[PDB]
Ligand binder design. Structure first.
Ligand code: HEM
Length: 87
């Protein structure tokens, strides 16, 4: 069974103590990845707590980066919150 989180829940994880973001409806805990990310901490920091899909896609990310992202998945956006934000 898939763990869901709402937007309101995710929105709280917006700082160094706990940073989550959403990509393509998956929820990622990037708390430790922030200082590993090749693209730096501040671009993650600026989108913390919400959907970052467009920005992730707009800047481009390798296949290797997309495979790496799977390692930080902690759950999925609640179905009733999908109409807000795009997959
Ligand atoms: C869990 C999610 C993420 C993973 C694993 C990840 C991983 C990476 C990796 C491995 C690179 C090096 C280049 C590449 O392989 O394409 C990269 C570069 C970059 N990332 Fe991410 N990234 C993530 C999320 C994001 C997000 C959400 C943003 C923007 C808000 C972002 C912005 C950038 C930028 C600006 C670069 C530099 C592009 C370049 O090399 O020219 N990344 N990322």
């Amino acid at each position: 069974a898939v763990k869901y989180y709402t937007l309101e829940e995710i929105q709280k994880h917006n700082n160094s103590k706990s940073t989550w973001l959403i990509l393509h409806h998956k929820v990622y805990d990037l708390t430790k990845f922030l200082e590993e990310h090749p693209g730096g901490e501040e671009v993650l920091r600026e989108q913390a707590g919400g959907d970052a899909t467009e920005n992730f896609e707009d800047v481009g990310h390798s296949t290797d980066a997309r495979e790496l992202s799977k390692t930080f998945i902690i759950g999925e956006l609640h179905p009733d919150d999908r109409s807000k934000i795009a997959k």
